[PDB]
Amino acid sequence: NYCKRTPLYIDFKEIGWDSWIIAPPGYEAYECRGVCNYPLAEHLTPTKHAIIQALVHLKNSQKASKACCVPTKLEPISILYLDKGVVTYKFKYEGMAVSECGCR
Amino acid sequence: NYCKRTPLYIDFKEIGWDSWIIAPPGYEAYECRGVCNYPLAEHLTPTKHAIIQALVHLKNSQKASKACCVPTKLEPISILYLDKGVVTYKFKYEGMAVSECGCR
Amino acid sequence: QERLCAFKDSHENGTILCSKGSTCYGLWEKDINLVKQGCWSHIGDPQECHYEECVVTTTPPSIQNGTYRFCCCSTDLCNVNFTEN
Amino acid sequence: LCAFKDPHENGTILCSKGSTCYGLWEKINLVKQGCWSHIGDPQECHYEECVVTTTPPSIQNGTYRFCCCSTDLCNVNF
Amino acid sequence: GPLVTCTCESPHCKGPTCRGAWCTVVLVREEGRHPQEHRGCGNLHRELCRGRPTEFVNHYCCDSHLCNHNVSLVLEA
Amino acid sequence: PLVTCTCESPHCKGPTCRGAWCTVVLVREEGRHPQEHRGCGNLHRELCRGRPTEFVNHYCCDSHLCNHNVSLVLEA
C-alpha cells in the first residue's frame, strides 16, 4: 500500500535473546512496510532530499531510487535482564519500538 | 551491493525548480542505495530496532522486512532563490545533500 | 493517570510514583520469593497492559526450569500480588 | 576572504569553513555577493576566477549571471 | 498562524477535508500510467508550490477557503 | 581500553581493526551458504549474550587478536 506502521511481534526466545532477557518474553515492536509514492505526505516527516529523490525517480527510474519507508521515531521499552547472575531491571531500553514511520 | 553513499546529481531544470532557484543550477546530492545484511556494520549507525528487525527476517523473510539503506545525516548547501520577485540568499538550505548513510 | 506502585530493589519506603502512564510490574521466583517490583513502561505494549490485576497468563520462560513469574497491570498498587491462568 | 553584499565592514567578509566566493549579476546590475558553501560539490565554485560557464537559467528572461571562485577577492568582477 | 480548511482527495486522507496553512493540488504521472490528481493540505515545504510544471509533476497552492476543490491541472508533454 | 582484532567482514578497510571487543558472527540464511564475519565491536554488547540460533550465532572476546581462528556453530 503506502508507508504504514505495520505490526510486528518480536519473541525474544525465537531470536535467542531469552538467554539474558527474563521479561518480557516478547514486545510489540513495529515495522514500516509500504512504498513512498509521490506526493510524499507530511505526516511521514519527509526531508528535502527524500522529496528531491522521489522527483528524480518520477522522471527516470534508473538514475535514482524511490524513498524508503523507515522508522522516524523510536521509543524505548522496559526489560528485566541478568547482569552477572543478578536480576537487573531497566526502565528505558532505548530504540526498541517504533512510534512514527516516515520516508527518508 | 552494500549501504553506500552513491553519487546523484540533481539538475534543477529536470525537476522544474529553475523557475525560482537562480543558483546553483544543480548540486551534487547523494543517494543511499544498497542492502542491509546482518551483521549490520557500526559505520552505518544502526539502531536496536534495525538490528532486531533484520534478525526476524533471517528466521522468516515473510513476517518481517530488512533494514533499509537511508540517509542518516543531511548537510545544507547555499542557494540563491526568488521570493516574491526579490533575490533572496540562504547560507544553510538544510537537508539537501547526504553525508552519512545508514540502516534503519 | 499517574500510577503509584510497589518498589523492591522519587521513591520513599517501598513505593514509587510511576508517571507518564507507566504500569506496575512484579517479578517472583517460585517457595515464592520476591525479586523486584516497580514501574513498567507502556511502550513495551505487550497489549498495553491495561489489566486490572497482575496475571501471569504466559508460560514462564524456560530459563531456570520455569520459576520466574512476571506480570503487569494498570491499577495503582497492583504489583503487590500475582495470579495464575 | 570574499566581498559582501547581503541584506565584516563595508563590502568585505571573511568566508570560513572552506566556503567559496560567489557573485550574482543580471546582464549589468550587481545583485548579491558573499560566501558559498563548498558542500554540494559545484564544479564551478573551485575556479580561479568568476567565470559564467553555466548557461543562465531561463528565469527573468535570461538575465541572471552567476559564477563562483575559490580565490581571495575574486568575486569583485567576472 | 491563520489556518485554512482545504479538500482532501489523497489516499493518506483521514477525512473529506483537512486544515492547514495552504491547499495543495498535485499531478504525479510521468510515463507508463494515467495521471493521478491529489488534493490535500500543506503546512511545510512551500518550495514545491513555486516549481515550473514538468512532464511528470505540477504543483499549485492557494491561500483561501476550499480553493483547491475544482482546480484542474495539466502535465507537460 | 582499545584492543586490536581480526577483520574478515566485507565492510573491512584493513586486515585489523581497533575496538572495545572482538566479534565473530555466523550468518546462515535458509537455503544459503553460511557466512562467517570477523570484526570489532564498539556498541551493543547485548548481542554478545545471545543463544546460538539456527540462523545466527554471536561471539565476542576481549583479548588481543582473539578472533583470528574462532569457528562457531548454529543450531539445527
Residue numbers in the entry:
A (entry chain A), B (entry chain B): 321 to 424
C (entry chain I): 30 to 38, 52 to 72, 76 to 130
D (entry chain J): 33 to 39, 53 to 72, 77 to 127
E (entry chain E): 29 to 105
F (entry chain F): 30 to 105
What does the paper say about this structure?
Upon signalling complex formation, the constitutively active type II receptor phosphorylates and activates the type I receptor; subsequently the type I receptor phosphorylates Smad1/5 or Smad2/3 to regulate transcriptional responses. For example, ActRIIA/B bind to and mediate the signalling from both activin ligands and some BMP ligands, whereas BMPRII is the low-affinity type II receptor for over 15 BMP ligands.
In addition, we solved the crystal structure of the ALK1:BMP10:BMPRII ternary signalling complex. Overall, the BMPRII-signalling complex assembly resembles the reported BMP family complexes, in which ALK1 binds BMP10 at the wrist epitope and BMPRII binds at the knuckle epitope. Overlaying the ALK1:BMP10 portion of the ternary complexes onto the previously reported ALK1:BMP10 complex showed no significant conformational change. We questioned whether fewer interface interactions and a smaller interface area would translate to weaker BMP10:BMPRII interactions in the ternary complexes. In the surface plasmon resonance (SPR) binding assay, indeed, BMP10 bound to BMPRII-Fc surface with ~5 fold weaker affinity when ALK1 was present. The fact that the extended conformation of BMP10 is only observed in the ternary not the BMP10:BMPRII binary complex suggests that BMP10 type II surface in the ternary complex may not be the optimum surface for BMPRII binding.
